[PDB]
Design an enzyme around this catalytic site. Structure first.
Site, mmCIF file in Angstrom:
data_model
loop_
_atom_site.group_PDB
_atom_site.id
_atom_site.type_symbol
_atom_site.label_atom_id
_atom_site.label_comp_id
_atom_site.label_asym_id
_atom_site.label_seq_id
_atom_site.Cartn_x
_atom_site.Cartn_y
_atom_site.Cartn_z
ATOM 1 N N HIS A 88 18.000 8.753 -30.346
ATOM 2 C CA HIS A 88 17.571 7.211 -30.141
ATOM 3 C C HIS A 88 16.301 6.955 -29.467
ATOM 4 C CE1 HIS A 88 21.640 6.736 -32.029
ATOM 5 N NE2 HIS A 88 22.086 7.608 -30.965
ATOM 6 N N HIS A 90 13.487 5.988 -19.941
ATOM 7 C CA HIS A 90 13.331 6.105 -21.221
ATOM 8 C C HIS A 90 12.391 4.845 -21.717
ATOM 9 C CE1 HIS A 90 16.927 3.643 -21.031
ATOM 10 N NE2 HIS A 90 16.516 3.123 -22.108
ATOM 11 N N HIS A 107 11.570 1.991 -25.336
ATOM 12 C CA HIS A 107 11.752 1.503 -26.596
ATOM 13 C C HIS A 107 10.456 1.219 -27.025
ATOM 14 C CE1 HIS A 107 16.208 1.038 -25.789
ATOM 15 N NE2 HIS A 107 15.841 0.988 -24.557
ATOM 16 N N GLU A 140 11.965 -4.784 -26.126
ATOM 17 C CA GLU A 140 13.572 -5.312 -26.317
ATOM 18 C C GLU A 140 13.596 -6.769 -25.596
ATOM 19 O OE1 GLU A 140 16.146 -2.182 -24.962
ATOM 20 O OE2 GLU A 140 16.277 -2.138 -27.359
ATOM 21 N N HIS A 182 12.440 1.485 -19.549
ATOM 22 C CA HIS A 182 13.660 1.270 -18.525
ATOM 23 C C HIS A 182 14.056 2.291 -17.733
ATOM 24 C CE1 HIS A 182 15.024 -1.525 -22.158
ATOM 25 N NE2 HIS A 182 14.459 -1.958 -21.434
ATOM 26 N N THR A 189 21.397 -2.193 -23.800
ATOM 27 C CA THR A 189 20.651 -2.466 -24.831
ATOM 28 C C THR A 189 21.160 -1.612 -26.054
ATOM 29 O OG1 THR A 189 18.848 -1.517 -24.805
ATOM 30 C CG2 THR A 189 19.075 -3.483 -23.672
ATOM 31 N N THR A 190 22.045 -0.565 -25.992
ATOM 32 C CA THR A 190 22.388 0.325 -27.079
ATOM 33 C C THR A 190 23.866 0.534 -26.828
ATOM 34 O OG1 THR A 190 22.405 2.371 -25.971
ATOM 35 C CG2 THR A 190 20.130 1.729 -26.908
HETATM 36 C C1 LIG Z 1 23.449 5.739 -24.356
HETATM 37 C C2 LIG Z 1 24.359 5.461 -22.941
HETATM 38 C C3 LIG Z 1 25.565 6.230 -23.268
HETATM 39 C C4 LIG Z 1 26.697 6.043 -22.052
HETATM 40 C C5 LIG Z 1 26.236 5.219 -21.156
HETATM 41 C C6 LIG Z 1 25.165 4.395 -21.028
HETATM 42 C C7 LIG Z 1 24.148 4.690 -21.877
HETATM 43 C C8 LIG Z 1 23.045 3.811 -21.865
HETATM 44 C C9 LIG Z 1 22.497 2.745 -22.865
HETATM 45 C C10 LIG Z 1 21.792 1.730 -22.633
HETATM 46 C C11 LIG Z 1 20.855 1.891 -21.484
HETATM 47 S S1 LIG Z 1 19.611 0.658 -21.493
HETATM 48 N N1 LIG Z 1 18.685 0.895 -22.820
HETATM 49 O O1 LIG Z 1 20.138 -0.823 -21.475
HETATM 50 O O2 LIG Z 1 18.533 1.007 -20.194
HETATM 51 C C12 LIG Z 1 20.978 2.794 -20.595
HETATM 52 C C13 LIG Z 1 22.174 3.678 -20.628
HETATM 53 ZN ZN LIG Z 2 16.584 1.030 -22.796
#
Ligand SMILES: Cc1ccccc1-c1ccc(S(N)(=O)=O)cc1
Ligand SMILES: [Zn+2]
Length: 257
Positions: free
Chosen positions: A61, A91, A93, A103, A116, A195-196
């Site tokens: 992803h 990471h 986006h 985002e 992020h 956000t995922t």
């Molecule tokens: C992908 C995941 C799996 C289990 C727990 C947390 C995550 C996760 C999802 C999204 C984010 S974001 N894009 O809001 O920084 C961070 C961790």
């Molecule tokens: Zn993110």
């Protein structure tokens, strides 16, 4: 299951993750004129001097640069936060085109990408416990615009060839995330979510006002990554962003006038 395509993208996520339609979902549009300056907001404290990066992973992803979070080595505190949040990974986006990819949006403007830096509240002991709490995570979000190169990003860019496909990882030690920060730490903040999927409502969002600049060649290399695993039909990892979600009963606060 879930992804970013027509048949499994953000419009579909609610069927497996009903919290997708919840009361504090992320990202959101940041309306700069409606955000209220909060003079009681403290400066952010970003302490990354002892950061220990370990590995970079294509998880299908995005790609995660992972850190040693078994000690208080790289921490975020201050700002809207009570207590200490440990850096676990960062990471990005990004888009298929320079005019999209972020985002969060700012007065409906989309940036080319969004960084992020994910932190979890040490009072909950581990990340898995933390994401089950309303104040479990603090994510520092930083916008990327295309212009001059970001020298501190280049070591990330140069390893992407070795993690082209889903499930690939590479050693990524001695990376200094301080090289990814803009000059100013002025920020907006609001309560939100991952956000995922699983889209858990566990995040205090801290979004920096000042974008960083990255070069067209740098983001070009993001776009050469693959969603797919090795030996599968190639699908470029682009447009891995969730669009802005309803603000509902929330106020965005600004640390600055
Ligand atoms: C992908 C995941 C799996 C289990 C727990 C947390 C995550 C996760 C999802 C999204 C984010 S974001 N894009 O809001 O920084 C961070 C961790
Ligand atoms: Zn993110």
């Amino acid at each position: 299951h879930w992804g970013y395509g027509k048949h499994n993208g953000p419009e579909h996520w609610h069927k497996d993750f009903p919290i997708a339609k919840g009361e504090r979902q992320s990202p959101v549009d940041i309306d700069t004129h409606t955000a209220k300056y909060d003079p009681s907001l403290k400066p952010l404290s970003v302490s990354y001097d002892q950061a220990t990066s370990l590995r970079i992973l294509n998880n299908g992803h995005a790609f995660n640069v992972e850190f040693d979070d078994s000690q208080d080595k790289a921490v975020l505190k201050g700002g809207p936060l009570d207590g200490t949040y440990r850096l676990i990974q960062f990471h990005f986006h990004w888009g298929s085109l320079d005019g999209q990819g972020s985002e969060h949006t700012v007065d409906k403007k989309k940036y080319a990408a969004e960084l992020h830096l994910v932190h979890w509240n040490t009072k909950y002991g581990d990340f898995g416990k933390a994401v089950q709490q309303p104040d479990g995570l603090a994510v520092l979000g930083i916008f990327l615009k295309v212009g001059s190169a970001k020298p501190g990003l280049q070591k990330v860019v140069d390893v992407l060839d070795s993690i082209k496909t889903k499930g690939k990882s590479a050693d990524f030690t001695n990376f200094d995330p301080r090289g990814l920060l803009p000059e100013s730490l002025d920020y907006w903040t609001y309560p939100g979510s991952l956000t995922t999927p699983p889209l858990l409502e566990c995040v205090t969002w801290i979004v920096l006002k000042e974008p960083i600049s990255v070069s067209s060649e740098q983001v070009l290399k993001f776009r050469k990554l693959n969603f797919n695993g090795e030996g599968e039909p190639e699908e470029l990892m682009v447009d891995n962003w969730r669009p802005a979600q309803p603000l509902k009963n929330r106020q965005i606060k600004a640390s600055f006038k």
